[PDB]
Amino acid sequence: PQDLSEALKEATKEVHTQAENAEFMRNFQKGQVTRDGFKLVMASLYHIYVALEEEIERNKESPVFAPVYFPEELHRKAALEQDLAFWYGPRWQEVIPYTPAMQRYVKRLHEVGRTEPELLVAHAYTRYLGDLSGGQVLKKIAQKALDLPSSGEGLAFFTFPNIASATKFKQLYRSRMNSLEMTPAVRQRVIEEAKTAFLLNIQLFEELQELLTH
Numbered sequence: 001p002q003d004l005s006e007a008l009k010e011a012t013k014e015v016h017t018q019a020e021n022a023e024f025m026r027n028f029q030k031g032q033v034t035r036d037g038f039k040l041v042m043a044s045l046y047h048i049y050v051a052l053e054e055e056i057e058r059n060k061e062s063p064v065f066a067p068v069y070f071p072e073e074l075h076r077k078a079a080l081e082q083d084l085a086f087w088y089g090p091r092w093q094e095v096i097p098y099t100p101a102m103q104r105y106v107k108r109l110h111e112v113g114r115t116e117p118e119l120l121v122a123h124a125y126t127r128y129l130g131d132l133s134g135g136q137v138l139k140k141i142a143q144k145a146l147d148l149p150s151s152g153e154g155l156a157f158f159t160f161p162n163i164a165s166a167t168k169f170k171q172l173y174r175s176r177m178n179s180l181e182m183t184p185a186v187r188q189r190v191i192e193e194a195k196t197a198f199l200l201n202i203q204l205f206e207e208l209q210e211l212l213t214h
């Protein structure tokens, strides 16, 4: 479509559906998810966000990203750090897994943020808006499947405290995206990257399923 936020949504509808149907993901939604499986996803999210957020902090000033820089409303590293301390304990940083699929997603994120930051938005959109959209559902699922204690910890990731209305925020984010100024050449690179980001998630899910079935 015309608006970037639309072109993105439409250009990734296919890969997005593949993501949904990925065995691991498909099972998660079907309510079937183990703690180890859940821990693997959380550990993955931590790594991905740590990388993504580092790159965002590096290019926040650039015009290629500034318009969609919403640190307070979206940052997840800290939330994830709280959750992993709960899921893996006080030395989670020294025990959480860091698999190849994860490693590869991180690598691309740093590649983008270092050499082609104009593509960073493709990842911020993919991750933030995706997690913001599916967050409420997935939470209740793992909340019902895992049956965690009353510790009052472990799921901070599913709550963006600095965002009152997900809907209104998404509207604002999309708008800032469409306001993002880029040449058509770049716009196409951003679209591709978004498909890449999905693929990366897909590879990731597939690898986790593989690890779990063993």
Ligand code: HEM
Binding pocket: 005, 009, 016, 019, 020, 025, 026, 028, 029, 125, 126, 127, 129, 130, 131, 133, 134, 197, 198, 201
């Ligand atoms: C349990 C699996 C999943 C289901 C069933 C699912 C379902 C949905 C639905 C129904 C929406 C809301 C559409 C809207 O608000 O217009 C959405 C949006 C989104 N999802 Fe997923 N999703 C899942 C997994 C993923 C994954 C793995 C990614 C990629 C990491 C992803 C990224 C996104 C993005 C970027 C959006 C926003 C698209 C836009 O701008 O309109 N989703 N998803």
Ligand SMILES: [Cl-]
Binding pocket: 165, 166, 167, 168
């Ligand atoms: Cl809402």
